């Protein structure tokens with residue numbers, strides 16, 4: 019008693035530990051799995067791609083919203099998106115289904131979020147930096163973009179739109 | 185006018201830390217219910233605006249909420265517990281010059297930062313992410329406030345060194361061990377914020393520079409930004425390991441398991457920050473994977489804890505006449521809020537941690553990042569476990585420090601407070617997690633766009649319920665806290681009582697294991713190499729290609 | 740006395756809650772891929 023308890027407890031304890039690590043490694047594997055599939059496309063680009071937030075909408079890929087989408091492969095479209103204080107450009111963004119859409123998103127002011135309702139696209143958008151994410155919609159239609167990073171007083175109203183064309 | 189202050193003057197300083205801490209918790213938490221209603225799709229803010237006229241927007245309120253609750257309350261509680269407990273264990277006195285200088289730093293720093301916050305000059309939330317530019321007195325105030333802890337680190341290192349000298353060869357006592365690796369951990373951790381503040385935020389808000397690189401700023405932030413939650417937790421763990429078992433009528437079933445847990449926190453708390461930056465650009469995916477792994481390892485200490493504590497409570501339960509596979513649960517002292525409060529805390533901490541381990545799984549984070557789920561996650565962690573622990577500990581700590589006793593009336597009002605808070609927090613956590621799976625973003629005044637989230641109809645109800653429950657609980661806490669700090673009933677003899685530290689069951693195999701762990705200098709240096717290795721590569725590459733951008737005020 | 744049945748029971752619950760959360764969300768991740 020009490021000294022008995024002690025050995026028992028410390029015994030089961032090592033058990034519990036070995037079990038726990040095992041289960042953690044199982045998660046480690048299942049994560050590594052997703053990193054090998056198509057679904058890992060949403061992981062932001064690692065390379066630094068610097069831009070100037072004060073000239074972003076005057077000269078460059080983000081200047082003219084009518085130049086936002088650009089076919090850059092046989093089935094690859096690059097969309098230059100701008101998240102700015104209280105909206106998105108272009109609005110709406112119009113893309114084809116079953117194509118690989120490469121988003122390159124930046125901000126002329128503060129930090130915004132780019133959350134595409136119904137997808138795994140959830141990326142922070144930093145001024146002075148390009149956030150590059152890849153994604154292939156499968157399902158058609160009206161995807162809503164939500165800002166999920168506090169940006170000011172109009173944050174809660176900062177929505178946008180994707181039109182993925184059937 | 186207190187002799188009890190004159191042999192134990194560390195008692196007084198402790199009390200000032202606690203009181204200042206709970207005041208901050210009260211003030212911050214007012215905004216809670218309103219924020220819960222807001223997530224229930226109700227707009228209560230005009231009512232608030234009518235009561236508290238200085239309140240200019242939902243976001244000013246949320247800045248006050250985060251800052252007073254998550255930053256101020258938690259740091260002052262840590263400072264009070266992780267200085268006083270080791271001091272009483274060692275029966276030594278803390279350099280009282282320095283102790284009172286640390287309390288002033290925190291108090292002056294608080295008041296300096298309060299002004300701009302209250303005056304709507306710093307509505308940037310508790311994470312204050314550039315380019316959002318607050319007033320200079322917010323950054324200066326916070327700096328001083330946080331730096332206070334550097335003094336606390338010194339004080340406990342001192343006490344340790346002095347005890348070491350008077351007991352050559354002896355292993356560091358448990359509580360003091362916890363507090364030492366605790367404060368060393370925090371020192372390592374705090375360098376990220378201090379670097380951000382000294383290199384960028386302070387010159388920036390003083391005028392010296394016009395720009396700040398957002399990516400480096402938030403990379404440095406989250407250097408500190410993760411370990412800081414462990415800075416919130418471990419004072420509660422210190423109490424749960426070394427005080428709860430006694431309140432439950434049992435013993436800590438393992439000393440070395442408790443040391444191991446805290447050692448692992450020193451080792452793995454800091455080099456995991458990129459888990460907060462999964463959705464950021466300009467950080468290598470490889471490094472994110474690495475940090476995701478280290479983050480799952482940092483879960484191990486809390487997995488250990490969950491067994492050890494559980495074991496100790498089972499053990500306590502049995503001593504009390506613990507029946508079968510759940511008898512021990514009923515045999516515990518559910519009539520004592522010091523016991524109840526942190527036990528409930530630890531209940532909610534199960535969903536809490538499970539959420540965290542989700543958030544930690546790299547790719548899975550894209551599901552929940554910046555959504556109502558993350559607030560769901562952390563109210564189970566800090567607003568429940570840590571806060572309940574704190575509240576509960578009023579029932580033994582307050583009397584120890586003041587000599588004021590605790591009526592049976594107060595003890596029962598306590599229990600009500602504790603059950604409501606806990607029930608309120610659980611309801612909310614379902615609300616927020618559900619809403620977060622439905623894409624509802626966090627940090628949003630969503631009641632101002634009523635038609636935006638129709639699919640979150642039923643969880644919005646839960647949030648409304650929580651808001652009401654937690655308001656009541658908060659009110660009853662204020663009532664009950666003051667009733668205890670406003671009476672003149674004073675037994676100096678209970679002020680002279682020992683802290684209800686629990687006894688520890690020891691084994692043979694302890695010795696060598698405990699001895700290895702006491703090699704603090706070694707383990708400190710290993711902890712620091714880990715930070716260099718986890719952050720060094722990335723930081724070097726961000727500093728090579730700085731891209732500052734101007735500030736903005738959008739409130 | 741003996742085997743810590745209650746402790747085990749607690750970590751069981753913990754284990755199960757972790758699995759429902761993880762696998763639960765792992766599901767949703769693929770559903771949104």
Ligand code: HAS
Pocket residue numbers: 311413414416417459460479480482483486487489490491493494497513527530531533534536537538540541542543544545549552553554558561562565566570749753
């Ligand atoms: C004090 C509160 C804090 C704790 C503690 C905490 C724990 C973890 N969290 Fe976290 N968290 C993250 C991952 C973790 C992980 C892996 C853990 C782990 O340390 C948790 C381990 C816990 C366990 C493994 C549970 C053990 C359970 C026990 C020990 C209870 C047993 C009960 C008993 C024994 C009682 C029995 C009683 C009877 C009567 C039978 C991640 C991802 O990596 C994010 C970013 C999400 C995003 O995208 O924004 C994050 C976000 C946050 C934020 C938001 C920050 C912001 O505003 O940006 C806060 C405030 C926070 C606080 C805290 N969090 N977390």
Ligand code: HEM
Pocket residue numbers: 213214215216217219220223246247249250253254257258309310311559563566567568571626627628629650651654655658
């Ligand atoms: C009165 C009880 C409380 C209620 C009803 C409550 C409710 C809420 C709600 C609904 C949010 C979401 C706000 C949003 O994202 O727009 C929130 C945020 C938050 N809460 Fe609480 N809370 C309470 C107490 C606490 C306590 C005690 C703490 C810490 C000890 C805490 C820490 C935080 C933090 C750090 C945030 C996020 C701040 C930010 O995102 O800038 N809360 N709270």
Ligand code: CUA
Pocket residue numbers: 102103104105129130131165166167168169170172173174176
């Ligand atoms: Cu853009 Cu919130």
Ligand SMILES: [Cu+2]
Pocket residue numbers: 409410411413459460
């Ligand atoms: Cu963290």
Ligand SMILES: [Xe]
Pocket residue numbers: 323326327381385
């Ligand atoms: Xe700061």
Ligand SMILES: [Xe]
Pocket residue numbers: 251255256293294297325326329
């Ligand atoms: Xe502060």
Ligand SMILES: [Xe]
Pocket residue numbers: 409410412
């Ligand atoms: Xe934080």
